């Protein structure tokens, strides 16, 4: 069974049927303004080749999703040890997942200013999706940053336990940026695809990251990846996966395929819509489950 | 190999000397936390096994995975899901369970055990199993928690259960005791997607075994699941007696019993054991 | 207090019955009539006057509270009372039902009948009327129904704050709860309280003056569940009120008031009850 | 109340300093005498008897009582419980609270800063009997820069759409607020004025309306002395407010103000020292409302 491209467009077709059904992010007002008739579909295989289908030119924030990404740079500089005593394993310390373990996560990124621990960050992210050109969304970072008073209510929560040092405005400019960072579902694919191979490029088998912290990533994927459904996800799909509210899913079918998906049409709970119908439908077809 | 699961079980032993055993139900404390033993049950349908194999051990909260196949089966996932929630009230904790176990069908309390073991025997493979009536009364003399919980469930329309009866009840499915072979027989019916590995007759269907194997990987070692998925990698349900029943997708059914618990609740010596077992033979679905 | 004064309040506060709703979560309150309301007053000359339905006898409900902290700080002590429960609006304080149900349990005696003879021999002596008893209807519809206490009582004995079989605790609770009188022998126990412990009448100490201050101060802090801190700005005196529409009331140094009201506002306190004391204590100064 | 007998009080009171400690998570509070206590009591016969060190104090949470009186008094009764709760146990529960205390602070009328500061200064000026009151630049600064935890609340009050004010104002407003300094003779003529239900004892014009010195000596009974006003009620049993700074300013209705300040804070947060003096007090002059 490989991931025929017309067998994608079918499926792709099908699952933009339900965008009617949801409702794009609108408490960012630069995530209001996405299209929720967009789908896009990515799968990228250890043969190094990606299939695709539907808006795949669209650059998309990812959002939550980049609080895998933060944690598996942060457990490379800073190795299990120190992370898992800041922040926790169970979906006590912080989950990382949550908004606010990511912060603290967020903050043990490693550097002298913003823009340094930031381009740490976007070398890593560049590595991972083989793409140089990655940057983040200035309009969608600008807009988060305006808005954020849930986000900065943590900071200061944070400050006062001691669990952090760092200064909230510069906390919070680091966090918008890496929430900021967007790409295309080919991108994302390709992430999901070095997870899959436990940390290996697909192209020169060079490990991105070391096969222990693939494996932290994907646990964390499937215990608590898809916001407050990670469980029904698990039934219902059941490969490791991390959703954003910008309409992405990352996923990790591990030693078979990346998958990046992006469907700006949220359901009731801040997973897309149009994206887990598709995967629901890919798993049940290609029976990509884990369970 | 044989051999070698008897060496890691004597490395795994070595452990016992810093766990304890459960205190809080009388009988559980009488365990020895020095008794270790595994199986490992195949698809070829061949069990190996090492240890302290001849013990009997109370499920304890691996029940709660049983109980809920049960009434899955007999209900649907459609009622299950409106009255026990999916997210890591859970089916795996106390609150949770006591509502499926509420949810078997049958007239007394007799008989809605008898359908609860009827399908443990079929699962196990083994017509003999029943329950520890020591541990069922130790529990049920002494479970002031669980039933606060039932009150509470009661005030809140949940259940419209007698809690004397549904107690009696759920000690009794907790004292369903099994040797750590019937156990992992268990583990390789999930593995195998709800099929019978002799006659390959669905003891339960695909969609029932997926879900049971979900509940596993997200909250089945009490509260340490995370940790878990990290450490060995594998669906997983633990309980307090030192039991842990392991489905490995396609692949093999364990069943561990190691009364020396952790001070997170788990098998401490079997923990041990099956980190060990999971690191020499790859288990790790993730 | 003129007597027809009070009568046209009791009526001015009728108007609100509509308003309201009897508790029927207790089956046999759910048969009590929204429209009855009741008020007697009474003062340290040892005089009532009183208005309304007078001749209704009503179950104190958690009303009952107020009087087993008073037995129990007098047969305990006050250290070990709260060493077992707090003072703050291990049991918060003696008012939220998991408090009372400890208090409940401090009650001495060898059987519950002993245990609540106790309780009745107090209240009888603190209202001045010897054939006070409890309503067996009221106790049984508690008793068969009162699932969150029974889980509070479990949640005890599992920390071990108390260690009474459950049912017993239950079958005496319930019929603590369940003791009834009209507003009259009500009014009655608020002026103890009101002359810091001494009976009215004979002048001598029912409690001592320690004890009727303790239960005072949770009469103010939270005495009207949910809604304690309002009472105190829109009528300003101890009170302790119950699902069954009582509101006992103890203006220091000045008088006691009973009120039975069964129709209940939103938040669990007699309506009709209340409206009626925003306007005695408007017209009565009764403000602390 | 004779001036001798409370200056025993006051040594009396004193013995405990050694078992209580200053607060020091504002380091400047930090700064304070553990062994200073300080008490007025002003009757309504607009004398004042005083002992022990009578020497400046920043009210701290006792500010809140005069804010939530000036918010009463300038929106309304209506609107000030449509924004916080009035009980003791996204809307604060009551003004008391740290959350209810910053939404009424916010609800403080003017276009700057310094204009709500200066309308809750002259307030304070006239219900204090004394235009010399001011508040501690010190104080404040060492409030501003480590209030996590009230920046965290004002956040969650923005996200919820209960406050509008930019969060930095807001906070540079209630740290001045809390360092408002004054003895503890200023602070009992403001008790009195709460006593006296709002009427200055010298002109006898009302410093603000009954119904609102009313409401005040409400929340000073069910919880003023935090976590610990129903022992207070039932060891005291006055109206009391108390601050971390050691303050407690209590109105004993139709009787006197009482101000004390004691550095030395049991577990609770109140005056050791403070609430000791107190308990001698209530006991000797029978103070006790209930």
Known sequence: ??????????????????????????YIPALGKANPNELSIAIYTPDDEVVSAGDVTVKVTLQSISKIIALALVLIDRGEDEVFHKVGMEPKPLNPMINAGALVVTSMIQGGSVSERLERLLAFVRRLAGNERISY?????????????????????????????????????????????????????????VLALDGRDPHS?????????????????????????????????????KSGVSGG?????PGRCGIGVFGPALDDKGNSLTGVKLLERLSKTYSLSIF
């Open 137 to 193: 969304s200035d309009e969608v970072a600008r807009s988060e940053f305006e808005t954020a008073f849930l986000n900065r209510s943590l900071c200061y929560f944070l400050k006062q336990h001691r669990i952090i040092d760092e200064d909230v405005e510069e906390l919070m400019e680091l966090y918008t940026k890496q929430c900021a960072i967007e790409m295309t579902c080919i991108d994302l694919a390709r992430i999901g695809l």
């Open 1 to 26: 069974l490989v991931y025929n491209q017309e067998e994608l467009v079918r499926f792709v077709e099908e699952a933009k049927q339900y965008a009617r059904y949801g409702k794009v992010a609108d």
């Open 249 to 253: 899913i990352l996923a990790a079918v």
């Open 205 to 241: 088998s060079e490990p991105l990251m070391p096969l222990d912290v693939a494996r932290i990533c994907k646990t964390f994927m499937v215990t608590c990846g898809m916001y407050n459904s990670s469980g029904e996800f698990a039934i219902k799909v059941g490969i490791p996966a």
